[PDB]
Symmetry: C2
Subunit: 206 residues, 2 copies
């Protein structure tokens, strides 16, 4: 009976292991864990007869660094265009350092695999939104799949703001849409489990 109690509790802990981890240890990440975790991630739901998600694992360090630097130069240009002071700009661009330092980086991407073709913008946009939600679901499933294998992770939206650069740098076709980036590694400092608070104003009753 204790074993059954432990099994149930484990199941109800899986997603509470998931932290948006900012600092990783230098330990190397076994490739087998990433591959398995991505296979688990792709169990997330998808619209009928579609494959909205692709994961793009940036294994080549020089390709990763080139992409990140171009993204940073753009981010810097945008913020300087907004008239922020240099200290505010460096503070903000510093938040993307995690992608430089991360042992592994995977970019989730939307692709229109199985998408229905509509003649009108409204249903076209709707389909595209629907595909976007599905990639989002696979992102969570990846983050959890990693946590359950002892791997910390963090999803960051930054690639969404530089999609053309991402397609250019990775030589991907125009309909591949990046939906952020996922840093992966062993957490530098261990963390306790989440103990979620009630939904309160985030759950609406009708």
């Amino acid at each position: 009976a204790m074993t059954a109690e432990a099994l149930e509790l484990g199941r109800q802990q899986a997603q509470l292991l998931r932290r948006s981890v900012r600092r990783f240890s230098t330990d190397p990440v076994p490739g087998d864990l990433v591959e398995a975790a991505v296979a688990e991630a792709l169990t997330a739901p998808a619209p009928h007869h579609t494959r909205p998600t692709r994961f793009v694992w940036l294994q080549t360090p020089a390709i990763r660094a080139r992409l990140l630097d171009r993204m940073k130069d753009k981010w810097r240009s945008d913020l300087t265009s907004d008239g922020l002071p240099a200290d505010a700009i460096e503070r903000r661009v510093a938040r993307g350092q995690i992608l430089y330092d991360a042992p592994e980086v995977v970019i989730p991407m939307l692709v229109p695999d199985g998408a229905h073709s509509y003649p009108d913008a409204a249903r076209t946009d709707a389909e595209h939104t629907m595909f976007t939600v599905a990639v989002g679901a696979a992102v969570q499933a990846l983050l959890v799949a990693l946590a359950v294998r002892g791997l910390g992770s963090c999803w960051i939206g930054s690639t969404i703001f530089a999609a053309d650069l991402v397609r250019d740098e990775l030589d991907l076709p125009v309909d591949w849409e990046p939906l952020g980036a996922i840093a992966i590694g062993y957490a530098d400092e261990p963390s306790g489990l989440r103990d979620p608070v009630p939904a309160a104003d985030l759950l609406i009753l009708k």
Copy 2:
């Protein structure tokens, strides 16, 4: 034993999740839905934002009026496309799941904490980022339900009828529906998933 079982439990969690199409008539305890929604909101979000709201349609007459209005739009959209009546009916029938489900919860995007940009490019990017985050919250809900013994299915249909959903639920223009989640005890139990290798869905660069 318990050390092992805890490890195994954690490993099983996402593998319990199925897109369940048929539910029992067993009523769903409210407490489990509420707890599942609390766990769903552990999904990641951009710094200092709260992209997601879950809108639990507890009142049956409201749920049926909303679905009815969506079905009406969907029918006339397809009639306009020139589909035959029987094909229209076949497609429309796929929506029956939301009528029949013991519980229906709508995931929604709200710009809580969105950054205000003067330009369309970053504005759309922010919006896409919020959308991704709601999808993450959706998976988390489906899994949080599964680990409490509850099946679920996410359907995209409300995305195609956003003004109707806001009109029928009296929500402000900036609340955006991102489908619908039907909830219940599965009619047939299901084994743990055994996920296949990623194959051509994982690209190495």
